[PDB]
Scaffold this motif. Structure first.
Motif, short mmCIF file in Angstrom:
data_model
loop_
_atom_site.label_atom_id
_atom_site.label_comp_id
_atom_site.label_asym_id
_atom_site.label_seq_id
_atom_site.Cartn_x
_atom_site.Cartn_y
_atom_site.Cartn_z
N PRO A 10 16.80 2.22 -28.76
CA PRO A 10 18.19 2.32 -29.18
C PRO A 10 18.62 2.79 -30.46
O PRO A 10 17.67 2.33 -31.45
CB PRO A 10 18.77 0.61 -28.40
N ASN A 11 19.86 2.98 -30.52
CA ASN A 11 20.51 3.48 -31.83
C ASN A 11 21.91 3.28 -31.73
O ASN A 11 22.40 3.67 -30.65
CB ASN A 11 20.18 4.98 -31.96
N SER A 12 22.52 2.85 -32.85
CA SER A 12 24.15 2.65 -32.75
C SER A 12 24.99 3.96 -32.40
O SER A 12 26.09 3.99 -32.14
CB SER A 12 24.73 2.15 -34.07
N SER A 13 24.00 5.05 -32.71
CA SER A 13 24.55 6.62 -32.40
C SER A 13 24.26 7.07 -31.07
O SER A 13 24.37 8.13 -30.65
CB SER A 13 24.15 7.40 -33.39
N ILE A 14 23.71 6.49 -30.20
CA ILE A 14 23.55 6.70 -28.79
C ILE A 14 24.08 5.62 -27.84
O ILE A 14 23.74 4.37 -27.76
CB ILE A 14 22.00 6.91 -28.54
N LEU A 15 24.96 6.06 -27.10
CA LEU A 15 25.81 5.47 -26.25
C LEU A 15 25.65 5.70 -24.78
O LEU A 15 25.20 6.61 -24.65
CB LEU A 15 27.23 5.22 -26.51
N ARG A 16 25.97 4.66 -23.99
CA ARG A 16 26.15 4.67 -22.47
C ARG A 16 27.45 4.64 -21.83
O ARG A 16 28.17 3.41 -22.53
CB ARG A 16 25.01 3.66 -21.96
N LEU A 17 27.93 5.13 -20.84
CA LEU A 17 29.21 4.71 -20.12
C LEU A 17 28.96 3.80 -18.96
O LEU A 17 28.09 4.18 -18.27
CB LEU A 17 30.02 5.97 -19.69
N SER A 18 29.36 2.76 -19.12
CA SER A 18 28.97 1.49 -18.30
C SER A 18 29.65 2.01 -16.78
O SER A 18 30.68 2.74 -17.01
CB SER A 18 29.41 0.28 -18.62
N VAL A 23 17.10 14.77 -29.15
CA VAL A 23 18.35 15.61 -29.68
C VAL A 23 18.88 15.04 -31.06
O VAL A 23 19.09 15.57 -31.83
CB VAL A 23 19.35 15.79 -28.43
N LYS A 24 19.03 13.81 -31.12
CA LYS A 24 19.72 13.02 -32.11
C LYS A 24 18.91 13.65 -33.30
O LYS A 24 19.28 13.89 -34.50
CB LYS A 24 19.95 11.55 -31.95
N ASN A 25 17.36 13.21 -33.39
CA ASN A 25 16.89 13.41 -34.43
C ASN A 25 16.74 15.03 -34.80
O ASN A 25 16.86 15.01 -36.16
CB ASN A 25 15.17 13.07 -34.00
N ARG A 26 16.71 15.75 -34.03
CA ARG A 26 16.59 17.29 -34.03
C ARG A 26 17.80 17.90 -34.79
O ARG A 26 17.97 18.86 -35.39
CB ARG A 26 16.01 18.27 -33.22
N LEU A 27 19.02 17.23 -34.27
CA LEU A 27 20.30 17.51 -34.94
C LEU A 27 20.43 17.31 -36.52
O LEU A 27 21.31 18.12 -37.05
CB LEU A 27 21.53 17.16 -33.97
N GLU A 28 19.92 16.24 -37.01
CA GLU A 28 19.98 15.74 -38.53
C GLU A 28 21.22 16.01 -39.01
O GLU A 28 21.53 16.74 -40.02
CB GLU A 28 18.95 16.93 -39.15
N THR A 29 21.95 15.38 -38.09
CA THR A 29 23.61 15.40 -38.57
C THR A 29 24.21 14.06 -38.41
O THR A 29 23.90 13.41 -37.27
CB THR A 29 24.29 16.46 -37.62
N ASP A 30 24.47 13.23 -39.50
CA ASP A 30 24.93 12.05 -39.53
C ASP A 30 26.14 11.69 -38.60
O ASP A 30 26.33 10.85 -37.56
CB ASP A 30 25.25 11.54 -40.89
N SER A 31 26.98 12.80 -38.18
CA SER A 31 28.34 12.60 -37.55
C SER A 31 27.80 12.97 -35.89
O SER A 31 28.85 12.29 -35.22
CB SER A 31 29.07 13.67 -37.87
N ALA A 32 26.80 13.18 -35.41
CA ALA A 32 26.42 13.48 -34.06
C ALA A 32 26.28 12.06 -33.40
O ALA A 32 25.58 11.29 -33.93
CB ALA A 32 25.26 14.29 -33.83
#
Length: 244
Positions: A44-52, A86-95
């Motif tokens: 998990p990562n604080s920048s990866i979320l799930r809609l409950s 995807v998060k890792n390849r984007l290399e963008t803190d804002s994503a």
């Protein structure tokens, strides 16, 4: 309170999207239980979320479909591996990635016609997910093992899938919404007809990744957790290469 997502992915289909990696029948008591083995690709990562199911964004953790594929014991699917890649390849803190699980085990594509319970749930959850301002980047779809059992279903699969994609794009008013579908790995029966339909569909902004050959659980039907990591990575590769 997570920071809301800006890049949203809809995850749908049947139980190999819902996730059964690591689900085993306890030999002591016959209960199905997820072994809780989590590959680092699924961390998990604080920048990866799930809609409950109650429509709140929360930090995402496998199993992603526990409150969605209700009445079925869920394990690992391809979603977290996809999201981390995807998060890792984007290399963008804002994503900030948002996942919208919608899959339902044991469902044939007729249960996903426009107007049906499952289709309307998928559309409603997708609309809810947009209220935070995030953009719908793609739909990941893995379904079809239930359509191999009857030749009428297998022979109509390509027409039904074309209609499902046309319907979603229309109802969400996203005429170019990327769809990444998965050619099924398992199911027996008329699997080859269903796979031919999936791999042969030619539509703008629709791509098919192939799950054939990925490791299967002892039931010869569901992907293992390590297969699901491979599939999520393949889905991320297709998303990144075609739509980014």
């Amino acid at each position: 309170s997570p920071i809301p997502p800006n890049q949203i992915f809809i995850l749908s289909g049947q139980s190999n999207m819902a996730g059964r990696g690591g689900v085993f029948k306890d030999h002591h008591n016959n209960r199905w239980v997820w072994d809780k083995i989590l590959p680092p690709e699924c961390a998990p990562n604080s920048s990866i979320l799930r809609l409950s199911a109650d429509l709140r964004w929360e930090e995402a953790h496998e199993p992603l479909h526990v409150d969605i594929d209700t009445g079925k014991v869920c394990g690992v699917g391809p979603g977290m591996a996809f999201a981390n890649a995807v998060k890792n390849r984007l290399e963008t803190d804002s994503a900030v990635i948002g996942l919208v699980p919608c899959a339902s085990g044991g469902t044939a594509i007729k249960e996903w016609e426009r107007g049906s319970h499952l289709y309307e749930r998928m559309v409603k959850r997708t609309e809810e997910s947009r209220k935070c301002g995030g953009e719908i980047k793609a739909v990941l779809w893995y379904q079809g093992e239930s359509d191999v059992l009857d030749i009428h279903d297998a022979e109509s699969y390509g027409n039904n899938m074309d209609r499902l994609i046309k319907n979603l794009r229309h109802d969400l008013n996203l005429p170019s919404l990327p769809i990444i579908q998965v050619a099924i790995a398992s199911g027996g029966g008329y699997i080859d007809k269903v796979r031919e339909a999936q791999l042969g569909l030619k539509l703008s902004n629709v791509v098919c990744v192939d799950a054939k050959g990925l490791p299967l659980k002892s039931d010869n039907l569901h992907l293992t957790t390590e297969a699901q990591v491979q599939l999520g990575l393949s889905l991320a590769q297709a998303y990144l290469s075609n739509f980014c």
